UniProtKB/Swiss-Prot annotation:
Protein name: Delta-theraphotoxin-Hm1b
InterPro entries xref list: Huwentoxin-1
Comment field (misc): Shows high stability in both cerebrospinal fluid and human serum. Half-life of the recombinant toxin is >40 hours in human serum, and >70 hours in human cerebrospinal fluid. Negative results: does not inhibit Nav1.4/SCN4A, Nav1.5/SCN5A, Nav1.6/SCN8A, and Nav1.7/SCN9A sodium channels.
GO molecular function: ion channel inhibitor activity; sodium channel regulator activity; toxin activity
GO CC entries: extracellular region
Family to which the UniProt record says this protein belongs: Belongs to the neurotoxin 10 (Hwtx-1) family. 09 (HaTx) subfamily.
One Pfam assignment: Toxin_12
Keywords tagged on the record: Amidation, Disulfide bond, Ion channel impairing toxin, Knottin, Neurotoxin, Pharmaceutical, Secreted, Toxin, Voltage-gated sodium channel impairing toxin
Tissues in which the UniProt entry reports expression: Expressed by the venom gland.
Protein function: Gating-modifier toxin that potently and selectively acts on Nav1.1/SCN1A and Nav1.3/SCN3A. It enhances hNav1.1/SCN1A currents and delays fast inactivation of the channel (EC(50)=11.6 nM), leading to a sustained current. Similar effects are observed at Nav1.3/SCN3A (EC(50)=11.8 nM), but with less sustained currents. When tested on Nav1.2/SCN2A, the native toxin decreases the peak current by 50% at saturating concentration, whereas the recombinant toxin only shows a weak decrease of peak current.
Keyword Cytoplasm: no
PTM annotation (Phenylalanine amide): residues: 35
Disulfide bonds: 3-17, 10-22, 16-29
């Protein structure tokens, strides 16, 4: 994996991988894969 695991303290979607979804309000990689 080349992305930060759940609660990786991200800032933007680019910070995480497709599998994850960096939230703008939570600011963390959300492991889901489907949005």
């Amino acid at each position: 994996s080349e992305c930060r695991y759940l609660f990786g303290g991200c800032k933007t979607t680019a910070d995480c991988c497709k599998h994850l979804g960096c939230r703008t309000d939570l600011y963390y990689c959300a492991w889901d894969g489907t949005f």
